[PDB]
Design a protein around this nucleic acid. Sequence first.
RNA 1: AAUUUCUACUCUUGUAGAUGUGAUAAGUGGAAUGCCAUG
DNA 2: TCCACATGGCATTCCACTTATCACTAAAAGATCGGA
DNA 3: TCCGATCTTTTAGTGATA
Length: 1240
Amino acid sequence: MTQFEGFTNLYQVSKTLRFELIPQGKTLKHIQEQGFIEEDKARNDHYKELKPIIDRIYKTYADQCLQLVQLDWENLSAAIDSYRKEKTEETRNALIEEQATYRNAIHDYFIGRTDNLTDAINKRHAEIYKGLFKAELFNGKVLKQLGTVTTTEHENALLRSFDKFTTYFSGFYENRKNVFSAEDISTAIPHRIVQDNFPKFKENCHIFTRLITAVPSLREHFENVKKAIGIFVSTSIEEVFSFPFYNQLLTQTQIDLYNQLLGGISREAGTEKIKGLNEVLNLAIQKNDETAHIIASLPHRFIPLFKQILSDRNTLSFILEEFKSDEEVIQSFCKYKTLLRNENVLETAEALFNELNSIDLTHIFISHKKLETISSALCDHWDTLRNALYERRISELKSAKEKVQRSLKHEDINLQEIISAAGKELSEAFKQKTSEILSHAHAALDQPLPTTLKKQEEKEILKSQLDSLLGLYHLLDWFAVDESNEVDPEFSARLTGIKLEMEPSLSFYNKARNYATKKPYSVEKFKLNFQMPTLASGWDVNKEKNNGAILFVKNGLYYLGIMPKQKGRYKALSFEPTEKTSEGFDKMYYDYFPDAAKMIPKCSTQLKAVTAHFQTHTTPILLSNNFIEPLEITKEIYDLNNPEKEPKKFQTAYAKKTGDQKGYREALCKWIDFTRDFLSKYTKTTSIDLSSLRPSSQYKDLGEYYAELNPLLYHISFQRIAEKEIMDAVETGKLYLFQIYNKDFAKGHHGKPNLHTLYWTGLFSPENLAKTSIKLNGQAELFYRPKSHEIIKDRRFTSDKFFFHVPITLNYQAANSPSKFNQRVNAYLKEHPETPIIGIDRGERNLIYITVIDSTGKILEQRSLNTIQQFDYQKKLDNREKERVAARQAWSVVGTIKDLKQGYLSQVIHEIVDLMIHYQAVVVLENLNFGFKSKRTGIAEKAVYQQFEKMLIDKLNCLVLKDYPAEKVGGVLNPYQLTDQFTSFAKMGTQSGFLFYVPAPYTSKIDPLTGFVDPFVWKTIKNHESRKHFLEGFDFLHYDVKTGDFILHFKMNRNLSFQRGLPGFMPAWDIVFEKNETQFDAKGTPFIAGKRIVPVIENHRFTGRYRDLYPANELIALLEEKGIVFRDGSNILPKLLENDDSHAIDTMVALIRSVLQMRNSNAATGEDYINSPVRDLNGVCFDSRFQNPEWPMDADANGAYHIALKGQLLLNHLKESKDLKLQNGISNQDWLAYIQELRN
RNA sequence: AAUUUCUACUCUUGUAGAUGUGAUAAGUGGAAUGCCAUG
DNA sequence: TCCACATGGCATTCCACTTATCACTAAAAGATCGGA
DNA sequence: TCCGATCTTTTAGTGATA
C-alpha cells in the first residue's frame, strides 16, 4: 500500500546555481588598484600554455610504459566469442571479470607490480608512478628520473610561475587520475586497450581470415599494396592480422600506421592517392563480378582503431600549410592576381577557345573520366551523353554492345564524335558556358581585393573570385592532354602551359577555405582566485581563514564576503556575534564533517604516528591531541582498517568472497562502536547529538550506516553581526563584499520567482535549518567576464561582470544512490492498475506528438506541439536549419541551435510534467539505436531524438512545482523523484522509473481498428514470374455491386516466401478496394476517399517526386482496358491471371502495393494520414481524414497510440508476473499477436 | 523588448517556462576540396 | 528494423554536437619563514 | 644555524541475500 506522494527523498541530486555579484561600496576600487583581475587572466593563460607541456610528460611516461607490454589474448577472445554466441548473464559477468583481469594486468605496468618485468625497473616504474599526482611534476624530480623531456628555460620559468600554487592543478590531477586507472572508466588507457580497441582488432582479424578463406587469390594483392605503403616491412600480411601482433598495437604511432594501412597515404592535391585496404575492397566490390558479389555477401569493410587517450595525432599523408593571418591571405592573393594578369592568361584562354570554335576537333580529345561531369553540367542528366555515344557506337556497327560499353569507360574520345553523337544544342551550350566562365574570370581579375577579412561581404566576394577561378580550372581539366591519342601537340603543349599555372589556384582555394571557416574569437569568462591557492573550497569556520568565502543575509538579500591576504599573509579577522535585535548582517556558521568514510580512517587510523607505533610494537596506543579524552587504538581495529588485502573485513566484499557472516557481522559491530566512540571523543563531533543511531548490531552494512550518519554532522547556524564593523572592514579593504543577484531579486519583480531562486530561498528557510534536506556544498567558483519605456538590447554584455557558480545538493537526508528503485515503481504500478499511459512519439515532421490512453485504451487527449503559446517552433527551427546549411555553403558564420532547441524543449517539458502531475500517469518512449538517431540528426538535426531524452531524465530526476507549497510533497523541501538516477546511456536500462523504453518497429504502420500490418515485402517481388506466383496465392476477388467496391480474400498460409514471416492472430483478411468517392470529415470538408500517394519512378532504380492515385478508378480502367466483365461479381483473379502480358501483372501488383501502403504523406500540400485497406468488422473502412476524436487524427498520433498500447502490454505483463520485474523488452510477433487479440 | 544563462511575448524598467557548473578526454555528424571505379 | 531519395571508399581542413568520468573538503602533513 | 608558527598540499575510502 503505497502512494504517488511517496516518491520523494529517494536519493541525493547535485545541482549548480549561477548568479551575478554586484559590488558593494568601494570594494570595486580595491580590486582595481590591487591588480588581481589581470593577474588571474595571466594565471589562466599560463595554465593553458603549461597544459601541453605537462601532458607531453604524461605522453612520454605512457609511450615509455606500455611499450613493454607482452600478454596473451586468447582468454579474452574466447570470452568475447562465448558472450557473443550466447548472450547469457553469467557469460556477461565472465566477460566483465576477464576484462577487469586484463585491465589490472595492463595497469600493473603503470603500478610497477608486473610479474614479467624484473624488480629494478618495477621499483623504478613504481616510484616514478608515485609522482604524477603530486607536486613532483614541477620540481623536476620526475623529469630527472623519467626519460629526458628536458623542458627549455622558457617552460622552466613557466613552471616557476606557478610556485606554491600547485593546488590550482588539483582538478587537473583527478582528471589525469582517470587516464591511469583500471576501474572501467571510458577516459582510461586500459579501458580503451581492452574493451574498445581489442574487439575491433579481433573483428579485423576474423574478417580478414574469412575473406582469405573465401577467396585467397587476393591474398598476394594486400602484400603488394603493403609494399605500396612501405610500413611493417619486417612483418607478414598474415601476421599483422594475428592476435600476438596486438602486443605491438599500444603506442599511438603503431595504431596510426595501422589506420593508415587501412586507409592509404593521401598525397598532395592533383596527384593520385596511394590505395589502401578498404580502397581495394571497394574497387573489387565495384567490378560487378561474381567475385564482387561473394565479397559483397561477407562484410567488406575494415574498421579503423580509436585514437589513444592522451597522445597526439600524426600522419604520413600530405598536410596543407595554413594561412597565419587575413592580411597575408589578401596580400598573397593580390600578388597572385597581379602575376596572373602579367601572364595575360585570360586573352590566352580566349585565343584557345576561339581556336576550338574555328578548327576541326578530331585532333582534340576529352578525358574519359570527365564525361559524366560534362554530361551533368551540359544536359539535364548525366546519362545523356554516355548513352548517346553508346547508341551511336551501336548504330555504326548483344555481346558487341557490352564490349562497346566496356570500351567507353576508359578510352578517351575526340570531341567531334561527341558533337556528331549529340546535337548542336550541346555545342552552343558549351560555347555559352565557356563565355559565362571567362566573363566571370574577367570580372574576377578586374575587381580589386577587399581591404580586410573581418566581415561577411569581403569573405563572400573573395569566395566568389575563388570559385570562378576554380571553375575555370575544372573546365580546363576536361580535355585529354596526354599523347596516348592523336591530340594536336601544339594545343596540348599550350594547354599544359596554361594548366600548370592554373594548378596553384586550387591549393590557394583550400588554404583560403581552411583560414576562412575558423570560429571567430569571442570574449570568455575566466576563473578568479584572488591570489589564494584555495578559494571557496569549503564554508567551514576553521577553513574560513584559508578559503576566505563566507555569506551574510541582510533583510532578504544575500551577500558574499571574501577575505583577501594582507601583505601576503593570512590576517585572522573575525567579527562579534551581537544580539539579534541589533541592525546588521547575519553571518552563516558552517559545521561540516565532509564524509565519514574518508574522514574517520584518515583522522584516526591512517596517521603516521599510529603506523610507526604499530609496525614496531603491537601494544594499543592512546591518541591525545585534538581530543577531549584520548582515544584508544587497538590492534584489531588497525588490522580491520589495514588487512594487507583488498577486502576489508567490515566491508561486504569480504562477506561476498568468503561467506563468513558471523565474523563479518562482529567486525562490522566493532567498527561501528569504534566510530561511535571516536565521534564521541573527537573535538569537532563531541558537540553533535548522535542519539538517533540504532545499536551497532542492528546495522546491515557500512553504506547504510554512513547514509544515516552523514546528515547529522551537517549544520548551519546564523549569527547577527554588527553592520558598522563590516563597513569598516570593506572601507579599509580588509573585506571584499559582493551582493548575490539575479532577475528575481530586483525591486521591480512581482511575479513568480525562478526555480533556482526557489532553491536558493529554500536553502535559507528555517524549515531546512531545522532538518537539512537540501545542502550548500563546497567548491564554489568565481568567474570574471569582460565586456562584449526605455529598453536596452543586450545590456548584460555591455559591461564586464562577476559571476558566481555554487553547487547544492537536494534530498540530503536520502542516500547517495537509490536501491531497488525500479522494484518500488513496479510495486506501485502493480497496486495501481488504472493509471493512464502517455505515448510520446518524437518525429522529423511534427517532432513531438503526445497521446493519453486509459487502462482500456480509450483516447483521452492527443496533441502535436508544433505550436506552444501560439508560436510555431517547428517552422522557425526549420528556417534556422535552412539558413544554417545555406551559411555553411556560403562560408558564413554557423551559429548554434542549442539555445532555441532548449527553449522549445523547455516548453514541451513543462507541458508533459503539467500533464504528469494532472494525471499521475507513466510515459512510454521508443527505444532507438544510437547509430540510427545519429544518422537521423545528420540528415536533419531538426529532430530532437537524443536531446529530449536527457531533458526528460534531468527534469524527472529532481522535480519541483513552483506553485506548490514548500513543505508539501513536490515543493522545494520534498521534490518529486520519478526516474532512476542517471548514470550513463550505456548502463541505462529498458526502464528508468516511470519511464519505459519500448521497441521502435511496428508502431506507425498499423491499423488501430483491426491490428493489420502488411505481411509482404516488396523487395522479394522483382521478376514477372514472382508477380504471377504471388497472384496465384490469393484466395478470390469479388466485385461488390452495392457500393462498387472490391473484396479480396487472403489466408496467411499462402505466399510464404513473399511473406515476411510475421504470423498474426486472425487467420483471414478481406482487403477492400473502396470506391473513390468524396466523403466529408467531422468539419464537413470534402475529400476523396481511399486515395493513395505513390513516388514517381523515373526509370530503373530512379525515382523522382510522388503523385496521387485512386485505386478503384485505374483498376476498373484496367478491367475495361482488357475487356474483362466484372459487374457480375465473378472471381476476377482466374480471369486475369491467364493474360500473360507483363504490363498487366505490373499494373495489378502496383495497385495492390499502393492499397497495402499505409503511411500516406504529401509534403507539398502537407496532408499526412493513413487509410486502412481492410474494413472493420462493424463495416467501417477507416480513414484518419474523418477527424473523429475517438481515433488518431494523423499517422504520428497513430504511432504514439500504438506505443501507448505497447506500454499497456508492458504493464499487463508487469501485473501477471510475480517477480516485480519487467521483461527484457518485447518482440514484434508477440506484439502484433496481442494487438490482433485485443482488436479482433 | 530587457534575463546567471536560454527560449517566447511586452500590462507593469517587466511576464511565463526551463536552466549541473568547472575541468579533462574521446567519439559522432555535417560542408568544402581532391584521388579512384559505379549506374 | 525504424526512415528514404545523387553514390561509394578514403584523405585534409573547418564547424557544431554528444557522451563519459571526476569533485562538489576539513584536517594531516610537509615546506617555509621569521625569531634568537 | 636551529626552533615554532604558518601557508600550502594531499589525503582519506561505501554501497549487493539469511
